[PDB]
Design a protein around this nucleic acid. Sequence first.
DNA 1: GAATTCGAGCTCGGTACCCGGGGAT
DNA 2: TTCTTTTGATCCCCGGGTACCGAGCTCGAATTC
Lengths: 262, 739
Amino acid sequence: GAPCQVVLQGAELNGILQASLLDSLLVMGDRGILIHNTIFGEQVFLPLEHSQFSRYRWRGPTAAFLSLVDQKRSLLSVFRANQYPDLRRVELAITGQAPFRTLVQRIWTTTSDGEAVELASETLMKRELTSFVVLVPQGTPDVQLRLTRPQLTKVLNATGADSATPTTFELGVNGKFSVFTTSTCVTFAARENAKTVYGENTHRTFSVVVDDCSMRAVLRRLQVGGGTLKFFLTTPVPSLCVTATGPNAVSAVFLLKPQKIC
Amino acid sequence: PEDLVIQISCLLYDLSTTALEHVLLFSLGSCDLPESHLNELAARGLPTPVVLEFDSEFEMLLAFMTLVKQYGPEFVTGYNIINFDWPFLLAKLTDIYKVPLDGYGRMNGRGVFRVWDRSKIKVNGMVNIDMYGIITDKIKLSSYKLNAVAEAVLKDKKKDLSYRDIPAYYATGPAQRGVIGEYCIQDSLLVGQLFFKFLPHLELSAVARLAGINITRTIYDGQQIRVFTCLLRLADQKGFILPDTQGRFRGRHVGYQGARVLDPTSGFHVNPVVVFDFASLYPSIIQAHNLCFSTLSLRADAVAHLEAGKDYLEIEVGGRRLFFVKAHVRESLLSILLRDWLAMRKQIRSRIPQSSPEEAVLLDKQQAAIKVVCNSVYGFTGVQHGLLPCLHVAATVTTIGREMLLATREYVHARWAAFEQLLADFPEAADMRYSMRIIYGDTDSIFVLCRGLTAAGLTAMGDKMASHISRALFLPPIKLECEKTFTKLLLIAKKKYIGVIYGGKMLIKGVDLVRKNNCAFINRTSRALVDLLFYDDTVSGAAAALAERPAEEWLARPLPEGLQAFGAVLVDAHRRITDPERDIQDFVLTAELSRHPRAYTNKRLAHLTVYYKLMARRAQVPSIKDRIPYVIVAQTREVEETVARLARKLLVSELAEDPAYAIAHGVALNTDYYFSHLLGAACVTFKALFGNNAKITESLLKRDDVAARLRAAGFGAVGAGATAEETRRMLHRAFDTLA
DNA sequence: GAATTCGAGCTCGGTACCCGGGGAT
DNA sequence: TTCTTTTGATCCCCGGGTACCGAGCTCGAATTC
């Protein structure tokens, strides 16, 4: 079909619908789509691999779309919880030349007797940005630990309120994971019951420090169900990434100020 | 009794030769005028000041009134002499000294010597022309202080003495009292210059001569007694009589339906926009259609013996059928009346060049006067509980006005829709090459956006178009005429637009650069922006490019590469607003009081706030139509506590200091407010570029600290600031870095 | 119960009036 | 004791105010993999 083509028929689309994120940026290309947004001053990402579509096909340089088509609607609003009840399928077809591509989104709802009505009242058309640059995370973390809903809920409870009281994810020797602040402190065991988190490269102790306490708001909006907590410190500015293990892989990088010590 | 008059300057000109004859200075106590001032007077040829010294205030005021009686100046003037000078003096002479002024006019007694607070004054046989009121209706200024008016009209940077500095001076010897006397004389010399620039007596006497009222009723009593007297003359000739109704008589509400304001196709129009409009619209309707009281018939019997359409007009006004019989049945008093005024309007202009230099100046003030009577007729009929009203005539005038605006629009849309029909009417269009759509209109004007036609000869054919329309549609006294041609127009809103007339001047119509609210800072930068938009090419290109996208697409995309200088001005203004020299005369807002501060219902206005702050500190309380200058001072814990003391985030009506205070006490300005209002003025104007979306415009005008720390964190950039290969190779580095 | 739904309840701007008032046309 | 007139209407925009109201946005507890 048209040159770059991303199709979600049913039964792989059900995973993507199962996976704030409307006024976003959609950096499509090879290896998939990256959905980037800024909430509260932090950078939140949602990768969507090329294997993770019923058909993903790309020809040309990567393209980047604002999600708000005509500044209200959204190219991801299709994948919402209950926006279109009877939806089955979406195709994203891109057609143009490298400085100017446009992407069109058609919708397909189930009928009886195995067919689909195209809701041509609500198809979307966007134009490739025609100038953009994003700053995506890179490399791999220093040490990453997997958590759960109750675990992650309580560690987010431990963290601060405003700039007065900076928090710190130190990991001590032989399983002293700790997310404290002055007047609240929580701790886990790191294995390679109920405070025994699993992870890898657990020997890599530190004590990171954050000055900006928007982590709680940020990661509560996305309603993360517990996931990876990844630390990145071989940069002048350490950053911590958080990736829910629920239906989605929605991640959020938070910048830990340069005051890195163990 | 202790707040006394100290000096009275009194210049005595000759009204005919305009020659200053005497310069008198009444002075309580010694007064030695400085030599520099005496020599400036002798240098300019002016008489030498005759300083008269007194012991007591009563003697000084008695000698002033004695001169007023003996010399008996037929005309008196001054600046603000009806709100301060005469009320101050007369309050002294009646309250304190109990002098009867009934004989100090021209009659030896039993004459009127009274002030009213417009605030009038009626001395008998003495025509008081306060130049304050003459200048507020001949110049649009934010401040009408005599220094600002002197600079703006006379090009005379005067030095003002503030009343707070007069006690310190007066206490010293005669030499400082002489300094006060010099500032007094110079004020009156400036007012004499203003009077002889404007020559209000000549224009107002042309009006008094034509109306039938004396000159003092012309200066003071309003527009209705002129019309009533002119009508009364006509009526008494024709055999009519004007009933009294008002003799038994005494919220944005309206009496009848006004005029039509077509919907603008807002936006930046870089094509020619011919502006037709009717000359003397409503007077021409009154004359064309023979509208009057004496020609109206509410009932269809009075005309039951007359042909319809041939002997009488019949029009639905307010859902009431109204019959206005035509001339050759009865000449509508209002039509007859207007014929004379309209004839003089054009006649004088034609014979102005055919006159002496002095006679040309006479026809200047005189003709301008005959233009006031033309529009005065319409208001007379539609004033409710005014003298001799008829809202049937006034509503008929506006009804025909609305019909004509639409009739003209439909004629233009039907006849000249294709260029062949335009060429058939006007062969001179052949060298001017399309569409021709009215994109705006107002009570009489229509803005015809002529696409495909050159702006060069478009007014010369617009005259012929206008004659064509006026011949085809309207009755003889009515006349549409092409008055402008904009080579660029920014139709902002209904009564708002900017546009550069053809090969020429900028016309700014009600877009707050022409409004007396704002501070010179916001006006200066707003003007800078509109000059960029209109004159500076490569910003008119970018601005005309902004319409190729719907407004919300600019919230995502980078704005066209020309408009950058349009934000450089804003950026500079942001710098300039915070800079700590910030002379706060650039930041002085104003507002007119316009009614007693008790007659407001919304008493939470900034100028009322500052009015009461001025009356609280015993400073000079403004008058009902003064302008009340004020700054918006920064919200500070002290200001907060003071406002609650006189009683969060304070309102702008509670951060409403006046500039004299805010300099004396070094109160600092509210940078937040003044910049938000700078951007507000920019947004109000330039929302027309962005689909009239003030929201989108605001966002795009208010358009680091993330890119910094990312470049610090070893993220390379991929996009603008590198060659395309460098962005590709870094994109490779990222994709293999994540994978 | 542990997730899990949309369900029900908060608040938090947003927009639009709604309005008076300035001050144009 | 103290005043004691005069054109008309239309229109946008701002400041000060109110009042929904959808959007989020988490909690709280029936229905439940």
